Symmetry: D2
Subunit: 461 residues, 4 copies
């Protein structure tokens, strides 16, 4: 069964129980590109609903929207915000129209769910109207970007939790491996001694910078253009409505929002999206570097560095034991490369704004929510399926530190530069340790245990 609806282009038959309407139906036909629909990015659906609740409350309080229609609309928004009706948001994320299809998907679905609450039938738009009532005082160009900013704010906690979790895992391994002496490597050449613990604490340290800079950057989104309507001149939406709507949207979302400084600027500026993507791009670059180290430090088992052992999560051959593919970090690098790619997409999109509008905010929101979700899962998997279970190869780390030619420097104040250089040269020609060569020159072994102690070199005063 179907019902019959009408827009400024004509009539169509919508399936009887669909909560979306004619406008959404056309957009499903117009933008069939990715098979990724609005409900694949639920945070934006929840956000549109909160913005639509805020406006309805504001209109009601200013006596522009009748009580029964406010009650019905609010109850409908509440349903969507608590995650009902998600399957009704069917529009492709790659939609044209600068956000209009998302706005209309929300307008129609809220309208019809509102009607259900009033005991009227779907499609009875004379009672609750998708444009006249649910979109009162509003514009795609202020509702959509406001919800976009809201959705990024709402999905902030998933990436913060993930960072904290990865931080906590590196800290623990930094503590566990505190006295595990090894050789540091610069340009991939053996340099001077360091512990495995300082090295893991430094992975921890780098990500502590990230959670701070991300928080700082997210705060730019608290600035909203709600009330500027179409191009920032705020025509058709009163000052009092804008004031009230923002106060309401703060209450609903639990986030203190404010009006942006210049709404004509805010109508078109995507600069904040570039900045936010940049910090996701930074996390991915840094994160990728960590994943690379864990791949390098565990290379082997016999003909690599073999200094750490990652947990074997992948099945192997009984006749090929010891082969441990660094499979979680690999999965992490792929997330990072993708995050970097998506970041360029945001850049091209941001760059292509014209006059009073950027038309490509839907592509932007899709890439940022994607990068955020992917990065959260990569970091969570890295922490629990890999980092938590890493083991030090204690003897083989020590071997590297003990084999360092750099230890010969500690002999200068005892035998003179010329002769310490000789030992250095000899140790390298013959392949023995500085310790072994030093012994042959009649220097005492228990004295050398002190002089050439690598843990002493790694830990400054």
């Amino acid at each position: 069964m179907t019902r019959r609806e009408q827009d400024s282009l004509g009539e169509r038959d919508i399936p009887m129980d669909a909560y979306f309407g004619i406008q959404t139906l056309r957009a499903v036909e117009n933008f069939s590109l990715s098979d990724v629909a609005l409900n694949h990015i639920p945070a934006l659906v929840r956000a549109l609903a909160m913005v639509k609740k805020a406006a309805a409350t504001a209109n009601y309080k200013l006596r522009q929207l009748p009580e029964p229609k406010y009650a019905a609309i609010v109850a409908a928004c509440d349903d969507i915000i608590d995650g009902l009706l998600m399957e009704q948001f069917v529009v492709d994320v790659f939609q044209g129209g600068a956000g209009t299809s998302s706005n209309m998907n929300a307008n129609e679905v809220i309208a019809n769910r509102a009607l259900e609450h009033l005991g009227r039938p779907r499609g009875d738009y004379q009672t609750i109207h998708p444009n006249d009532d649910v979109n009162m005082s509003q514009s795609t160009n202020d509702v959509y970007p406001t919800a976009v900013r809201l959705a990024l704010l709402l999905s902030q906690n998933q990436v913060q939790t993930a960072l904290h979790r990865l931080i906590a895992a590196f800290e623990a391994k930094g503590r566990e491996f505190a006295t595990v002496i090894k050789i540091g490597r610069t340009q991939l050449q053996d340099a001077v001694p360091i512990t495995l613990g300082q090295e893991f604490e430094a992975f921890a340290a780098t990500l502590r910078e990230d959670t701070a800079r991300l928080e700082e950057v997210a705060a730019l989104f608290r600035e909203v253009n709600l009330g500027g309507t179409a191009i920032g001149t705020r025509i058709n939406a009163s000052h009092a409505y804008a004031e009230q709507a923002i106060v309401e949207l703060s209450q609903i979302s639990g986030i203190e929002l404010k009006a942006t400084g210049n709404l004509v600027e805010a109508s078109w500026d995507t600069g904040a999206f570039v900045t936010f993507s940049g910090i996701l791009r930074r996390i991915a670059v840094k994160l990728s570097k960590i994943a690379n180290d864990l791949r390098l430090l565990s290379s082997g088992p016999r003909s690599g560095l073999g200094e750490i052992r990652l947990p074997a999560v992948q099945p192997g051959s009984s006749i090929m034991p010891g082969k441990v593919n660094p499979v979680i970090p690999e999965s992490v690098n792929q997330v990072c490369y993708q995050v970097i790619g998506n970041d360029l997409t945001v850049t091209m999109a941001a760059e292509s704004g014209q006059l009073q509008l950027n038309a490509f905010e839907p592509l932007i929101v899709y890439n940022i929510l994607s990068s955020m979700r992917l990065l959260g899962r990569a970091m969570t998997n890295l922490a629990e399926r890999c980092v938590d279970g890493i083991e030090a190869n204690v003897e083989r780390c020590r071997a590297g530190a003990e084999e360092s030619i750099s230890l010969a420097t500690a002999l200068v104040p005892v035998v003179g530069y010329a002769r310490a250089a000789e030992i250095a040269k000899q140790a390298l020609a013959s392949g023995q340790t500085v310790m072994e060569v030093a012994i042959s020159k009649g220097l005492d072994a228990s004295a050398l245990t002190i002089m050439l102690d690598p843990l002493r070199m790694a830990f400054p005063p």
Copy 2:
């Protein structure tokens, strides 16, 4: 209800109904990252099955695999090639493992479907073994990349068909607007006359270069490393098996494949993916510019260029008639920006190869298969729902042409550059036409109506 399987890491309970095994089950746990499973890229599944059919056949012909197992493996691969069992390919496209997870997902499903065709229950690997039988004479590092290449080859037609569709839309609007004179624009300044038809056929002409460049580049994927195994040294696979498996994979896929020249180089080289991601990027860059020209030319209705009118696919406000948001092109632009980024993701991945292998082909194949699909759909919509129904504002077009001070350009071959420049400046300074200004200086009214016809200036 579950069944009990064993791998190198130990024992695990697998759902009764599942054709995948303990190795796939583990990879599903290890790489839960995106929610996009292998089944979202079915051409690679289809391709993986094709390779498994070919390998099985070549092992049977060299008497390495006995007949009853051969007949059962092949039957199972056929079922996969025919679109059955797709829901069993459950591994995340962002998998670590350089392909092993996709490879093992095929091994386990093939073995359990092969077991079923042969009477026996899921997990009786003593009979059909995922590793020892289905993966016989193979390594992830040769079967997976070959599947990757075959999956790209088989996806050519969706993009070629869409390019051919868009070309035909433009060609037709080219003929429809052959005499619709308008003004050209360089650097957004008014230039010399041209027809809308010429503009449109130009769009079709650039997408013709693209269909050819695409064939040429897709052709590199015909070269496969099947039988190089782990690192290119051919260990565990005979020369005889390699040639035979290629002959067989050629017959099965409908495409003439050949052995690549250096299996050692081939084991790790990802330049073929960069090249092909590159033409997709070209198509994106070209297609996005066309979309942009469509948005500019349809700007208005009254304070834009207003030279064309796209079909109104999006309903507008009853109080704001004449607003047509160039919504299909916008959607295309956005597809184009996603393809460009995807091309960088392939770049990052491709550059990060180490020694005998590149560990990130899962990412590469996923990004290229996506961009191919999005370009196909974007071009097919652009053609069917925008171009086919575009209409010219004939009088606004004409008006930009006759108005133009550029009409003096056509007097350079008459009175030399200098005197013609002089005529141009006098018209602009005195508010007279170039026609008006030129009779002034003694030239025949008769010859000028012809010489300064803007439609004449558009053609040789």
Copy 3:
């Protein structure tokens, strides 16, 4: 005429009148790639010299360096700081060795200039040694990334001065065009009325956001790893030395520096370069939109939007008087594209770090200093040679606002949606203003002149 120098690889002949040494000579031969030498980023040379002055002073105060040597080194450093000896930094910016070549170019030059401020010959390194004395307590790995941070910090001003300059240009125009009413455009479709002044003050507005983010990001460079030596374990340099050197470098540079929190992390973290490069990327993205807006609003003279007119800085085609190519925004566009490519370069280099070091700080620092210098010049040019002389086309702007259909919304509470939608459709259908159609239906002329005033609509 040459002199004879030795390093661990052997003996070489160095030009007699060179302040550089055998290690710089070797570097010149090793990385001849680009024809762009260290002196082409002088801010890094000055910075290297400041840090060397900081190290010598701290070394002096802690009694690791004797007073005669301290004072010669310090005086050499001052010469470089003052702009002398720039022709002696000859090493390619594309150098390998992760800083070493730049550090040794500094060390040798400073040693040799110290030798004359002390009356000794060039090359007499038993008296002033480039490694033992000028690099004392130091490694490339902490000296070089500290110089980079300082260089970037000392170049902040130029991009700040240029931003403020362009802000002021736009603000000034913002006042001038306050009442110049025109139609807004969304998706290139006629929207609602706005003033050219508002549009221009929004340009200013966005750039003021950029000045604050740039400042805020620059501050991250204030944290230095100086003292951390080779890998961040402080080997060969004491706590007191590091504390003292950071105090002394803060005095020398004029910027309050502080020791970074974790020196092991600092040894390899290139993240701050990514964040910063991101703000340049952002500026470029915003800047290119603005440029694009200026090229669009000036399109014409006859058949574009014709809303503004940019000063003519190139001479025109005389066969087309009144054609003005937007030559200055194009040049800015090209700069913005470069900065964005440049940003990807940094992104690769940052990602490529291995274990205790990232080897690619020289490529990172070169690209950033380029980008900064480029944006600084671009924005100055856009302010002085374009924005300041922009003229508004008052009548063409006004006609766009009056001919708009958005006007018909003002009539909804006068005559009702229904009848006001009809006025909109008849206006479009007949080619008349909302005003002319509204006058037909009998509505009062003097109420309509206020009602459908576009200037009124522009301001809440």
Copy 4:
């Protein structure tokens, strides 16, 4: 001492000295952005003068350019083609104008040099006009992109020569290390045996691919729009003029050039540049991974892979012997990252085309010519200064192979899977070779020497 010139914006004073005139002088002031002038990309300056000469010659042959002025213009183009007058090309490569400023620099300089050949004074434009004569039958939008295509064709040789050189260095090391057995590595895990020579021969094979792809992509540039003028309509250039100019440009340059199929399309289409940039990018991507492989194989000396030794080109300290920074690969990598960014710069300029013209070819040509030049020099330096001198650390290579657990598979036909697997497991636990475990199970040493030969595993029949 100066001279006085005039354009449609007033008068200015130009150095008596100079061959450029008033228009070039304004361009110097208007576009001061980089300090990189036209003389930094001489290939373009030369190509412009080739096109200029072709057009003069064509005009002369159709009786539109007087013989004396033809002779003088041609002698001037000849001087520029032969490398004279380079310092008169002073405009910034970052020019606005879509190439007009480069075209006018060519026009003016040629005019003044032609005048000198007639013994006339500088700026006597009544005799030789930069627009009227030197620019006859031409527009910027056909001459400049033609000059650009030909600048890239003139330049192709340096990158092709560099590629062949690098190829040659790899092939020779391929031969020299033909029997240096080592362990192959997949995901940084020990895999199966392979020879170092095979590894180096793979480098050669992959760069051979690049020469073929570069050649075939460069051939797209042979298609030129000379004679399409402003927008592809050909106004002001006769069919005959165009036919003759192309025949003539082909003769001057030594390259079979042909008119492009659709001059309207060709007026704006930047697709050929993207494709050329892309194969440079692809060279960067592969070159970079070779550089990385080199830095990794040479890692150590003692706590890395240490399979090869790169020539020490950078000096070290006498107390720290054995430390060899992989300094030339590092500079290759850096170049590769630059080219990859330059490819993004091109992609931006290309996407930015509008209607009948793309305005950003000056930036495009500059980036591609830079990229080509860097790639050439990096590849040349890698060959002469690193590869040609690489050494194998032969015993360490052989130890990697013997330490490999993959050897146990050879034992299957001999002792059954179960026992073969048991040996592999025991070798892994004790850090012993498969050979050592095998001996201790009472298998014969001279038998096992044959069975477990790594060199047989590296080389198929």
